Amino acid sequence: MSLAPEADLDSLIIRNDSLSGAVIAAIMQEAGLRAVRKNRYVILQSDLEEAYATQVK
Amino acid sequence: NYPLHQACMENEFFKVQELLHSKPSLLLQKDQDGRIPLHWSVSFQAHEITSFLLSKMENVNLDDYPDDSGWTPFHIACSVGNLEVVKSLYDRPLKPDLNKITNQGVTCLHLAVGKKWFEVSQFLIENGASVRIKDKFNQIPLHRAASVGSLKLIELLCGLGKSAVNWQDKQGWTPLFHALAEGHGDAAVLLVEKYGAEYDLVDNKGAKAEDVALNEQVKKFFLNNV
């Protein structure tokens, strides 16, 4: 779906620069899945931070 | 499921009046993400709904209303960019703690800067917002201003804000490292030439700021100017 207006995706990228596009896509796909469990059509920071927490290491 | 909240996302004013009139206890009800109606009206810049809701929240300190991610309506406001909404939320009886951090440890200033909202960032700083709160990755707003390559923000933070300039993040990067990794040659030299940024520090992989340059053109330009 789409990112909420106040979302900050360009925050996950600034951390340990050098993430393959694949990982970025996995994170986004994972965030979208989390929004779905909330019955929301928009992605919030929590979805992004959570998605990142389990796609990086 | 959360009618009022929905009305706020869609900016259905007449709808908000109606729902609140019927069940006043909905003003501060939190939805599935821990948000109250004000989080959403602010998120979608519904100026009328926001004012209306605030008129009913005179006793409220926004610091007591972080959503599930730790974001208060004020963090949301600073991230969206509208100076007028931020002002509205600020000029109330009780004032928001300008340094309140989210669960990732970020402040409102981190948010406005990363999105390049100059006016909002200037407003926070002019009212006392610290320019050195370190988030979970040990980055301060300057780390973000450099990565987006905003000269305007770098001077605001290092000038008016007297920001620290050589702090290194969890990755070992100072703001300079960020400017060069993203191809912002002029912001990089601005940090070195005007605000005394050191370019001899090395990150956790032994690299120096000039060694993480987007390409050896930015690299060349930088060295040719510091």
Domain enclosing residue A5, as ranges? 1-57
Domains and CATH numbers, chain B: 1-226 (1.25.40.20)
Give the closest of B43, B45, B137 to A15, CB-based.
B137
Total number of domains constituting chain A: 1
The verdict on a CB contact (< 8 Å) between A15 and B111 is: no
**What is the C-alpha to C-alpha distance for residues B39 and B31, in angstroms, rounded to an integer?**
10
Closest approach of chain A CAs to the CA of B69, in angstroms? 5
The residue among A11, A18, A34, A56 with the most chain B CBs within 10 A of its CB, best to mutate, is A11
Deposited experimental method: X-ray
Q: How far is CA B128 from CA B96, B107, B123, in A?
A: 11, 13, 9
Bridge partners (DSSP) of residue B208 are B202
**What is the C-alpha to C-alpha distance for residues B67 and B60, in angstroms, rounded to an integer?**
15
The verdict on a CB contact (< 8 Å) between A6 and B147 is: no
Tokens of B120: 């909002």
Resolution of this entry, Å: 2.2
For residue B175, what is the nearest residue in chain A, using CA coordinates? A14
**Phi and psi of A21, rounded to 5°?**
-65, -40
Q: Encode B39-98 in three state secondary structure.
A: HHHHHCCCHHHHHHHHHCCCCCCHHHCCCCCCCCHHHHHHHHCCHHHHHHHHCCCCCCCC
Residues of B in contact with A49 (CB under 8 A): 69, 103-104
